[PDB]
Amino acid sequence: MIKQRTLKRIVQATGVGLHTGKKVTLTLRPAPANTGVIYRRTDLNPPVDFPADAKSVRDTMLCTCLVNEHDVRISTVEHLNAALAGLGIDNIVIEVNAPEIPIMDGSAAPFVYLLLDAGIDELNCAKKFVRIKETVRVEDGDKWAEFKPYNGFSLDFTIDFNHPAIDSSNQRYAMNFSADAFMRQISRARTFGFMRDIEYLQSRGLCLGGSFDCAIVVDDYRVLNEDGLRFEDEFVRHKMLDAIGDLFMCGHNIIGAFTAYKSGHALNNKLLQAVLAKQEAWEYVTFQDDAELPLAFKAP
Numbered sequence: 524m525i526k527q528r529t530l531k532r533i534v535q536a537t538g539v540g541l542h543t544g545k546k547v548t549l550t551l552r553p554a555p556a557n558t559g560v561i562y563r564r565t566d567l568n569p570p571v572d573f574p575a576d577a578k579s580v581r582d583t584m585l586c587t588c589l590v591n592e593h594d595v596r597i598s599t600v601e602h603l604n605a606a607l608a609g610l611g612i613d614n615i616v617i618e619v620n621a622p623e624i625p626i627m628d629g630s631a632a633p634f635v636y637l638l639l640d641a642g643i644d645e646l647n648c649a650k651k652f653v654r655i656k657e658t659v660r661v662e663d664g665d666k667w668a669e670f671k672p673y674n675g676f677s678l679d680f681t682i683d684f685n686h687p688a689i690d691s692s693n694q695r696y697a698m699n700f701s702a703d704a705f706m707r708q709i710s711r712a713r714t715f716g717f718m719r720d721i722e723y724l725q726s727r728g729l730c731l732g733g734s735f736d737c738a739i740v741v742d743d744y745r746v747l748n749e750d751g752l753r754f755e756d757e758f759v760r761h762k763m764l765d766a767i768g769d770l771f772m773c774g775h776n777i778i779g780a781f782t783a784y785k786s787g788h789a790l791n792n793k794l795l796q797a798v799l800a801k802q803e804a805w806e807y808v809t810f811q812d813d814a815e816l817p818l819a820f821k822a823p
């Protein structure tokens with residue numbers, strides 16, 4: 524039987540918050556079956572829990588955040604979340620002594636090593652997948668995103684960029700998901716921003732953790748980062764990293780075909796909620812028989 528997974532041990536890491544620029548300590552903890560993904564703020568007293576849920580997401584100007592019933596927030600969860608999907612973590616408590624998850628290097632990679640340090644513990648309870656069984660499409664102007672039936676997990680992402688430092692042949696990425704493919708082809712792709720906008724935010728006391736160490740920054744014409752890009756198409760690879768993180772907000776791996784044109788956090792989440800809202804568009808499935816398990820969701 525394909526079992527739910529959690530961490531073997533508690534691990535910690537430090538880093539700066541994108542918003543505050545202050546040092547944030549991140550603590551990852553094992554969690555029992557069926558409890559899912561829980562983000563927790565321990566700076567507040569008492570601590571506040573934010574169960575990962577599609578309905579709780581808000582797409583703020585910088586990255587994303589979760590909210591509780593009083594509109595208290597925890598921000599920048601999507602890159603760590605993406606790593607959770609990549610390494611097949613189902614139940615976990617994620618604590619920060621701050622209002623946000625540390626930005627690290629702007630990618631998911633640093634979270635990969637952290638999770639590997641924590642190890643894997645299988646729990647005696649079947650892992651539930653969300654199997655798409657009807658086509659579901661959402662739109663927003665000339666932007667769209669859809670899920671289609673497909674015995675696997677694939678993502679097909681096209682981004683509309685006109686920036687001189689981003690060539691056209693690098694405005695589409697497509698992959699058949701897997702722990703190994705995520706770790707190698709996606710996890711290291713960094714987030715990115717426009718330098719003048721960042722300068723502005725920081726002059727208003729925002730995005731104070733922003734630096735070359737946590738993002739690809741371009742001006743009107745070029746990449747400013749000394750070493751350049753980790754991939755020629757790092758921008759679109761990161762957009763796919765963000766898609767995986769957005770979709771995993773439901774706490775389950777989805778068996779289906781994801782396609783998106785000019786999509787982002789808002790649209791991805793709108794699709795996620797659209798799928799879950801229609802009862803006949805999806806169903807839970809488990810794998811009592813391991814050989815049944817789609818290629819895409821095999822252990823790392």
Ligand SMILES: C[C@H](O)[C@H](NC(=O)c1ccc(C#CC#Cc2ccc(N)cc2)cc1)C(=O)N=O
Pocket residue numbers: 541584585586587601602714715716721730733734735737738740765
């Ligand atoms: C891609 C998505 O839209 C989105 N990215 C952000 O919202 C985002 C991206 C980059 C930054 C930044 C920065 C910086 C800097 C810097 C400051 C000073 C100096 N000297 C050099 C560099 C913030 C937010 C995101 O990835 N969401 O998941």
Ligand SMILES: C#Cc1ccc(C(=O)N[C@H](C(=O)N=O)[C@@H](C)O)cc1
Pocket residue numbers: 717719720723724
């Ligand atoms: C706070 C804030 C804030 C958020 C977004 C923008 C923005 O749209 N900047 C524009 C731009 O084209 N950026 O690439 C143009 C204006 O440069 C500017 C400021």
Ligand SMILES: [Zn+2]
Pocket residue numbers: 601602714761764765
């Ligand atoms: Zn991102």
